[PDB]
């Protein structure tokens, strides 16, 4: 692991809806960096199932454009801690959450990015501030943030 | 001026020699996300000149290569705060320095960038502090960090 902030007594139901990524940071200016870049991804909403599995649907752009992207994180024996089936297979690890404003999220191989998700398309600096000291535990090097009026926009444009 | 932090009895003639932009921001993650990102500048070497102007050297990437670059800051009535003679004339503020471990300094049009510079190739915690408390003051939405490793290399590569 590198993550050692897991959220106690998760209710995975009680995140669905609708989420903003406010602020993203990885380990790596590769992981951001650039439109295409590989985790450079804006969460559109979360379903949970009832199994306990979470899709995600989310925006990317790919194709010299923004491209939609549904997901599946599979639960794991940790409530917190749930895994995405790619080649190698990915953990997504929820930090925080108070359900109604804002949720705290990484995902880690090594390598590793976080994100600051918040309900409505608002500077929640409060948010930002936990989102911060959750971070600084960690080796991140680069660090974005987004405005109201990009979070209207399609992959944040 | 968006910079109110400036550096009182700042003796230009004592920033002279080798730096490190160890970390940089921006208030547009245009102006640093790319390689190619109009503020991402490596710094080399500051070299005052006895009339108290600064001459920078510094490498951008731009010709899908890494670039050397001299250009000239001139002296203004106020100590801290510099002049380059671009199409708008843009205003270089020094906020902090203890001239022998770190300087912190701000490039402002509207937006701006600020860098956190070091004398060796090392991760400065210290000086990577009065950076971020520096900058809360400040609408910054790009921030990068390099390792020692990239320090060494043309580029930060
Ligand atoms: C409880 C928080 C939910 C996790 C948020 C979404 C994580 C997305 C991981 C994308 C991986 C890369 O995605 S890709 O489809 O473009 O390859
Ligand atoms: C005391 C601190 C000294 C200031 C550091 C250097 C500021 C460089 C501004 C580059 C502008 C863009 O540069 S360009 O030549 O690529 O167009």
């Given at each position: 692991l590198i993550v050692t902030?897991?959220?106690?007594?998760?209710?995975?139901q009680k995140v669905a809806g609708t989420w903003?990524?406010?602020a993203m940071?990885?380990?790596?200016?590769?992981l951001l960096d650039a439109q295409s870049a590989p985790l450079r991804?804006?969460?559109?909403?979360?379903?949970?199932?009832?199994?306990?599995?979470?899709e995600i649907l989310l925006q990317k752009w790919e194709n010299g454009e923004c491209a939609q992207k549904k997901?599946?994180?599979?639960?794991?024996?940790?409530?917190?801690?749930?895994k995405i089936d790619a080649l190698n297979?990915?953990?997504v690890?929820?930090?925080?959450?108070?359900?109604?404003?804002?949720?705290?999220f990484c995902m880690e191989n090594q390598s590793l990015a976080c994100q600051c998700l918040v309900r409505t398309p608002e500077v929640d600096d409060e948010a930002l501030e936990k989102f911060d000291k959750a971070l600084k535990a960690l080796p991140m090097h680069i660090r974005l943030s987004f405005?109201?009026?990009?979070?209207?926009?399609?992959c944040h444009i």
């Open positions: 902030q897991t959220m106690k007594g998760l209710d995975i903003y990524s406010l940071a990885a380990s790596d200016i590769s991804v804006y969460v559109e909403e979360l379903k949970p199932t009832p199994e306990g599995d979470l997901i599946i994180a599979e639960k794991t024996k940790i409530p917190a801690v749930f297979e990915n953990k690890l929820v930090l925080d959450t108070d359900y109604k404003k804002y949720l705290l405005n109201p009026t990009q979070l209207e926009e399609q």
